[PDB]
Design a protein around this ligand. Structure first.
Ligand code: HEM
Ligand code: ISZ
Ligand code: ISZ
Ligand code: NA
Length: 250
């Protein structure tokens, strides 16, 4: 809604389709879907609606943005994708990284998030510090996702479900371990685990726990824990919106 997607050439479209297939095989084989989802999300999550700066515009590959503390370990993601990207010189890094994120969700069994090409690679990384802090709560989440990015409370909860794949690493954030028993499977288990309480071997961040106590977030957690179809629907909506922040006006 509110989007006017740019025209791209037939050759650009062909490259998107071929890159999508190549990314599926590569991501599946390398077992790096969670990292690629994090790479897409950190690329997009810096958008500030009031100034129209940051967002999914290829800047995460810049040494300067990779250096941001929130981006610990994402230099691995960038390196892993570089040989593949070089096979698709016509694609923007901006598009390529968002496409990797969409593919990461698909190959782990998640919803098919619609993808529209045309993001341009912008020269200037956003300032550091826009991404959310795992030790903070619901107010902070609204500041970051709502006031800056311009996403809804529904989007916040659905997107938090992205933690249904992958893990924290004590050498990256300092937190450690997977949120779920199946960290390469995209499903609603993140909310199931969040509701059941702490379990040995499984992670919950203070930012995850903040969803349980908020009057608006909690009914959504409950909905998603009960109804994976509803989760997949709202997830696909939120991921699309996230991937298109500042793109296509909008
Ligand atoms: C709600 C605010 C969020 C906070 C505070 C947060 C925080 C974190 C932290 C601390 C890690 C661990 C990094 C590491 O140590 O390796 C992590 C990993 C991850 N995040 Fe989030 N995150 C948030 C939202 C999101 C969103 C919106 C998505 C995507 C939709 C997402 C997807 C992921 C994935 C897939 C991983 C695992 C990466 C891997 O396995 O290497 N997160 N997040
Ligand atoms: N960050 N860990 C990974 O996902 C990974 C890193 C290097 N090669 C394959 C996978
Ligand atoms: N808020 N947590 C993060 O996103 C993060 C912080 C430090 N290193 C990696 C990830
Ligand atoms: Na899972």
């Amino acid at each position: 809604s509110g989007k006017s997607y740019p025209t791209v050439s037939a050759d650009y479209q062909k490259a998107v389709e071929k890159a999508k297939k190549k990314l599926r095989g590569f991501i599946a084989e390398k077992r790096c879907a969670p990292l690629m989802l994090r790479l897409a999300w950190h690329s997009a999550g810096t958008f500030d609606k009031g100034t129209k700066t940051g967002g999914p515009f290829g800047t995460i590959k810049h040494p300067a943005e990779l250096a941001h503390s929130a981006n610990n370990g994402l230099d691995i993601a960038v390196r892993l994708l570089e040989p593949l990207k070089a096979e698709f010189p016509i694609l923007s890094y901006a598009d390529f990284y968002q496409l990797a994120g969409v593919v990461a969700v698909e190959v782990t069994g998640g919803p098919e998030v619609p993808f529209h090409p045309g993001r341009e690679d912008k020269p200037e990384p956003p300032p550091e510090g826009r991404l959310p802090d795992a030790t903070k709560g619901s107010d902070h989440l609204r500041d970051v996702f709502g006031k800056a990015m311009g996403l809804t409370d529904q989007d916040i909860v659905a997107l938090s479900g992205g933690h249904t794949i992958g893990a924290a690493h004590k050498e990256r954030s300092g937190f450690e371990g997977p949120w779920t028993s199946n960290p390469l499977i995209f499903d609603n288990s993140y909310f199931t685990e969040l509701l059941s309480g702490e379990k040995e071997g499984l992670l919950q961040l203070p930012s995850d726990k903040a969803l349980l106590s908020d009057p608006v977030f909690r009914p959504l957690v409950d909905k998603y824990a009960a109804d994976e179809d509803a989760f997949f629907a709202d997830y696909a909506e939120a991921h699309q919106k996230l991937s298109e922040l500042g793109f296509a006006d909008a």
